[PDB]
């Protein structure tokens with residue numbers, strides 16, 4: 001698990017307007033919901049051999065191809081499958097949160113950025129505290145894609161898109177992604193399949 | 194423990210232009226550096242009773258007042274101490290990275306956002322994968338402060354600032370912080386003491 005550059009697919013699934021919830025609903029609700037969400041999102045990544053890199057609040061950072069090697073295509077296959085499954089999971093999550101009173105508060109939507117690229121994946125931090133993650137623009141991209149894409153929209157990088165049939169690529173488009181000294185070709189892929 | 198709202202001080206220390214490194218220096222250098230950095234940053238938080246909530250890449254998210262209760266004042270005291278110590282740690286880190294060839298690549302600088310406020314801190318995620326973190330605008334604030342403040346500048350929220358003597362508050366100022374439906378009173382505090 002020592003940090004090494006690795007072609008991995010970083011999938012970031014951030015909940016759209018989660019702050020609009022961490023203020024709207026109650027703390028327990030925010031946790032219950034978040035945890036429920038992350039439970040299903042995580043489920044979505046793990047179910048897709050994904051690796052929950054970490055949760056950055058309402059954002060899930062899934063790595064594909066790390067720590068367990070995974071073909072770039074699988075990484076994307078999985079990441080996209082995860083992203084989509086997450087949306088499906090979210091479909092039910094909102095169904096339940098709506099029918100419960102946790103949403104209905106905008107029906108929890110999540111932006112998903114999936115990028116594949118060289119990231120230094122491995123354990124990072126002090127020996128006093130290390131977390132397996134991916135470091136590098138690759139990650140940034142995924143994250144920026146995540147935040148760049150519309151709610152319940154899976155925005156993947158050019159790198160990722162090449163694995164998804166054009167039919168599933170709703171719309172390609174370069175986007176000025178923060179931290180990216182170059183317009184990244186983003187392809188929001190079909191949230192379904 | 195289980196997620197509960199908690200007045201905690203979220204400290205985010207993100208490395209300024211780390212992507213300008215995850216591209217500049219080599220992977221091993223990026224990891225070696227990042228880990229070295231996070232090692233000292235982490236050190237800085239733990240040494241200040243802080244809690245490394247997680248590392249979000251080059252960003253360290255430290256919680257103060259979670260999971261171990263800590264007086265709001267201590268939280269800030271510690272968070273600020275950490276932020277400052279981090280800068281000091283970074284001072285030496287760059288000293289070494291510079292004298293090594295890892296920087297000199299802009300001398301790794303870090304933005305530090307320290308905010309104190311109600312956050313739902315506790316374990317989040319699925320039982321399949323839980324991470325102790327703080328959720329809620331409080332965190333967002335710290336993060337936005339972190340990214341809002343200039344490099345090697347510790348930007349704390351009004352909440353935090355009240356604990357730091359005005360003499361240490363380099364400059365107060367409200368900032369349109371993303372995700373914050375209200376101008377947050379940010380106070381970049383003296384990075385020294």
Ligand SMILES: Nc1ncnc2c1ncn2[C@@H]1O[C@H](CO[P@@](=O)(S)OP(=O)(O)OP(=O)(O)O)[C@@H](O)[C@H]1O
Pocket residue numbers: 014015016017018019020055056057058059147246247249254326327328329332333334336337372
């Ligand atoms: N537990 C946590 N750990 C680390 N970073 C966190 C965090 N919680 C928040 N942040 C940081 O705070 C930032 C913004 O917080 P949101 O993303 S929770 O707010 P939003 O209403 O959901 O906004 P939208 O999803 O764009 O619609 C995150 O990107 C993190 O850097």
Ligand SMILES: Nc1ncnc2c1ncn2[C@@H]1O[C@H](CO[P@@](=O)(S)OP(=O)(O)OP(=O)(O)O)[C@@H](O)[C@H]1O
Pocket residue numbers: 053054056061133134135136139140141143144179207208209210211212213248249250251252340
């Ligand atoms: N290991 C990781 N875990 C989670 N999120 C991560 C991540 N690495 C990156 N991100 C996400 O990618 C985003 C940007 O990546 P940078 O911060 S590494 O790039 P920069 O040049 O340092 O940017 P600047 O510090 O503003 O100058 C982060 O905010 C995370 O949401």
Ligand SMILES: [Mg+2]
Pocket residue numbers: 014015016017018019057058059
């Ligand atoms: Mg979010």
Ligand SMILES: [Mg+2]
Pocket residue numbers: 014015056057058059
């Ligand atoms: Mg987020």
Ligand SMILES: [Mg+2]
Pocket residue numbers: 207208209210211250251252
């Ligand atoms: Mg950074």
Ligand SMILES: [Mg+2]
Pocket residue numbers: 207208249250251252
């Ligand atoms: Mg960061």
